Amino acid sequence: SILDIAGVDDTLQRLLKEVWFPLRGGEACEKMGYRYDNGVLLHGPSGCGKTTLAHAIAGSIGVAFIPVSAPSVIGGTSGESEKNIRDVFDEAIRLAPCLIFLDQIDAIAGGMESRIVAEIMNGMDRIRQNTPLGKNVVVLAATNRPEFLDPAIRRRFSVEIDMGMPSERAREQILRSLTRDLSLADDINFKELAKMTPGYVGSDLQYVVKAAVSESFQANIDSLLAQARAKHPADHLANVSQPQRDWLLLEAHRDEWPSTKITMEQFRKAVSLVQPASKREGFSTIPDTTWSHVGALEDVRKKLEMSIIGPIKNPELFTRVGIKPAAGILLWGPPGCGKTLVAKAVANESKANFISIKGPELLNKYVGESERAVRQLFSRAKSSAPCILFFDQMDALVPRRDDSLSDASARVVNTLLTELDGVGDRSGIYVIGATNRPDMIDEAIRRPGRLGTSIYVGLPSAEDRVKILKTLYRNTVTTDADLEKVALDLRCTGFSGADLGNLMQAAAQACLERVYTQRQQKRKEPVITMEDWEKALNEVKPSVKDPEKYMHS
């Protein structure tokens, strides 16, 4: 029924004046004298409720309904396939007004295959001819891939309804509708559930409800397991893991549940267990790096927490002062200074979806597939907004368009430039680029709308290295007073963040050599001491020999 499908208020508004009206109020069109050749097409992400909606609407309109499944058209003969189609468009005309639902039209509208499309397209013209023009016949087609349709058919479907993905207000309606016949607690905040399910569709929200129901029965399974244990005194307790025993215990009886209700804590657990269909492929795991792993870089942190982390958490607070919820940032500086570190901290501290591109990872040897990967990269970034796109070592993906560029990477630079233009100010996509050679990256990528924000990550100062060395040593376990002396030592003049990490590793290795000799003069716990830092400072040199090169770009 209509009550069972929610969150489609915009879609149900168009279907009222484009499907319902020329099926029940055709007399007004007859008085107006206007033929209805509108072919209504339903398209959107898979799982948005196209098939279910088209059957709930069909049952509500009340006119004759002819469900058509594309695989069921084929009967076993080349000529029999047209017989099934010719028995549909004739029946609808004979029983006008009528509704035709061509579910999964692209399965037979992408020999026998080339003749079904011709029969389908001719059958729509007969609808316009063999009708009183006051009893319209509407053909409704649903497909999640509108681009696979034959242009001879998609041209005949003037009305196209893009359901799209539900918004926060719409997802709240779906969640309330799904949890309508269930027993619920009082802590369930459906508005909070809608906030933390971005990129979800109706099917994904159905899994979240389904996941929470299983959690509500977890307590009813442990009690069932305990009864089996009490019946078998110490059975299969050796050489069998606990999960294996649980299957064996429940397999024994197979012959012999209190009605509890779902709480709010189980709904939060359910959301984590459910991976939305938009995130099944193409998304990277959230990095384990936090802001506690990033030492100093307060200036870079403030810019990142005000352009990316900020707008994601409070999209309304920032938009009041003219801060749009979308940014393009080009981190640049000498190598080893933390461009990738802060980008991994932003991806983890923003709680948003993350896509990482490792240099020229999108290039493909076939024609067009290299550019389609770039376009598909921004297609799934929009569907899972907010999303952070991190282009690491971006100088290899958008090189300077010199004479020595070939007509293969230029076609990718142009595609990437256009996709960055298509990213709106309120889209929710935050693109981060990192490169240590800004003189090899195209100057067209730094225009506004594109990566027009540049953040320079450079070598730490003497006071800055103290924060970084304390950060590195803290996350691996000398105290803290000695760390200031080590980092402020003049031998660390050009040390970057990586060099300080190399310095700590050298001290750790120097400890083990001392430990190895320590255990030979006693036999015959390793702790990094201050004397280990003394010989680590001597044998570690800065990696960035000429820092001026990396900042003169």
Partner: peptide
């Protein structure tokens, strides 16, 4: 009718990299 497995063609059209030479 019997459905048959048929052999067909493809477009492919791979793109290859090249090496150039420069003057002094």
């Amino acid at each position: 009718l019997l459905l048959l497995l048929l052999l067909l063609l493809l477009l492919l059209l791979l793109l290859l990299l090249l090496l150039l030479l420069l003057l002094l």
